[PDB]
Amino acid sequence: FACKTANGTAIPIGGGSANVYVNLAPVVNVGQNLVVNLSTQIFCHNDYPETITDYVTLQRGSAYGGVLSNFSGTVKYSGSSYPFPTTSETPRVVYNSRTDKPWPVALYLTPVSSAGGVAIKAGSLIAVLILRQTNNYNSDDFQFVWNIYANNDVVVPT
Numbered sequence: 001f002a003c004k005t006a007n008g009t010a011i012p013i014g015g016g017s018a019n020v021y022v023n024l025a026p027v028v029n030v031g032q033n034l035v036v037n038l039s040t041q042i043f044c045h046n047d048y049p050e051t052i053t054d055y056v057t058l059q060r061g062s063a064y065g066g067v068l069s070n071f072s073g074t075v076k077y078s079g080s081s082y083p084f085p086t087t088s089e090t091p092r093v094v095y096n097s098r099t100d101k102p103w104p105v106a107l108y109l110t111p112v113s114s115a116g117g118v119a120i121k122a123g124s125l126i127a128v129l130i131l132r133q134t135n136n137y138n139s140d141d142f143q144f145v146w147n148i149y150a151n152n153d154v155v156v157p158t
């Protein structure tokens, strides 16, 4: 089991950390959602499906910077919504193929009444998402830590 991002930076077997840079809608109105879709950004596969089935959760999602200040959030995991920042680990997605399968995560961030102006700065950390991988075979329990950065400013109109 290992993962890779859409621009090809990898986290190998056993886990680790990696930075992910994402384009964001440049303008978002108070009350509307800024959608951050990581399923186009993060892909994983099982290295031994003949024998091992892999289980993958979103263990923790954390908000930083402009996102923690200026937005209210939820996270969708495999189509089901939870509070963001997270208050529990999600149920597990099954990885049973060597095919690259997206990690089914998306953030829905709504600017709050006070947001107005530059609400997220280019280059800033907006989130840290911890993918947790176990299996039905041994004691492996690894963390793949994804640091999510904005590629551009997000403006909330006044």
Ligand SMILES: OC[C@H]1O[C@H](OCC#Cc2cccnc2)[C@@H](O)[C@@H](O)[C@@H]1O
Binding pocket: 001, 002, 013, 014, 045, 046, 047, 048, 049, 052, 053, 054, 134, 135, 137, 140
């Ligand atoms: O994707 C499956 C497995 O790939 C990796 O393991 C590959 C292996 C093996 C193996 C080979 C022969 C006998 N038993 C296990 C690990 O990332 C492990 O955590 C994971 O469950």
